[PDB]
Amino acid sequence: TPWSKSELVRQLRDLGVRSGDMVMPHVSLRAVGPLADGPQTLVDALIEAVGPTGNILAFVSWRDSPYEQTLGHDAPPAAIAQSWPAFDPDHAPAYPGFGAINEFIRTYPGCRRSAHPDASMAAIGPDAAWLVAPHEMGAAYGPRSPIARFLAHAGKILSIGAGPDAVTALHYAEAVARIEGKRRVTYSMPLLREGKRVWVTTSDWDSNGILDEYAAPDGPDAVERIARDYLARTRVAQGPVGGAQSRLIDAADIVSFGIEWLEARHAA
Ligand SMILES: NC[C@H]1O[C@H](O[C@H]2[C@H](O)[C@@H](O[C@H]3O[C@H](CO)[C@@H](O)[C@H](N)[C@H]3O)[C@H](N)C[C@@H]2N)[C@H](N)[C@@H](O)[C@@H]1O
Ligand SMILES: [Mg+2]
Secondary structure: OOEOHHHHHHHHHHHOOOOOOEEEEEEOHHHHOOEEEEHHHHHHHHHHHHOOOOEEEEEOOOOOOOHHHHOOOOOOOHHHHHHOOOEOOOOOOOOHHHOOHHHHHHOOOOOEEOOOOOOOEEEEOOOHHHHHOOOOOOOOOOOOOHHHHHHOOOOEEEEEEOOHHHOOOHHHHHHHOOOOOOOEEEEEEEEEEOOEEEEEEEEEEOOOOOOHHHOOOOOOOHHHHHHHHHHHHOOOEEEEEOOEEEEEEEHHHHHHHHHHHHHHHOOO
16 A cells, blocks of 8 residues: 555654654655655655644755766866756756655745755755755855754754665764865856856865765765764664654754764864
């Protein structure tokens, strides 16, 4: 029997999602199981559990981000620079690798999209506009980004069948941690400004490994190692959403744990 919206809403209530909550979901749809009306059933259940006063924040990114094509260069390669489409936040589809649910969240009516092409976030709720802006190049996940305002606004991380590597909010901990040898990257993004395509080159913290030992491909990063340690030492509400196992995590608490975790292991 495919899961109905109402069943999902009640499981989300059992897990601890309250009216008015600020929630960031990481969803594996395969672990959830079949839904009454496909992935939209889970989106509707999230909106309903969070209520008319709550908020959803999702890391959707961009399907056609020229990250690899421009990473390491002082300027976009000529072939890339002439033909690559500019980031249109109203029509650019989400990145499928971060979850198939994100394209349904971003096309939901009233959803707002942040301006960062590679680190794009989508928000639904009365505080959506406050969440998504500003989001500038050079502040992907660090202070002054949507994740920062999410952390200050009692955000909860809702992992539905996702692994510990999926906690996007922990990249904030990498940004602010006082440790030596933090890796940075340089890449270019095509932005749409006053109707016109403009290429912008910036540098930011390497979101694929803040230090060399976490940048390996094979290859657990700092985010996964922090999350595994956290989940082994912390009481966290656990339960099923659909057929997937889910955890509701206090975002400020795990980020705070991540800063101490990184700073205890690497001198300043
Ligand atoms: N390093 C190990 C981790 O890698 C990926 O997670 C990363 C993404 O790679 C990164 O993405 C960036 O780099 C990609 C590859 O160059 C580009 O395609 C993409 N546009 C660009 O946003 C996110 N920003 C942060 C996230 N933790 C895997 N999901 C995760 O399971 C694994 O633990
Ligand atoms: Mg409010």
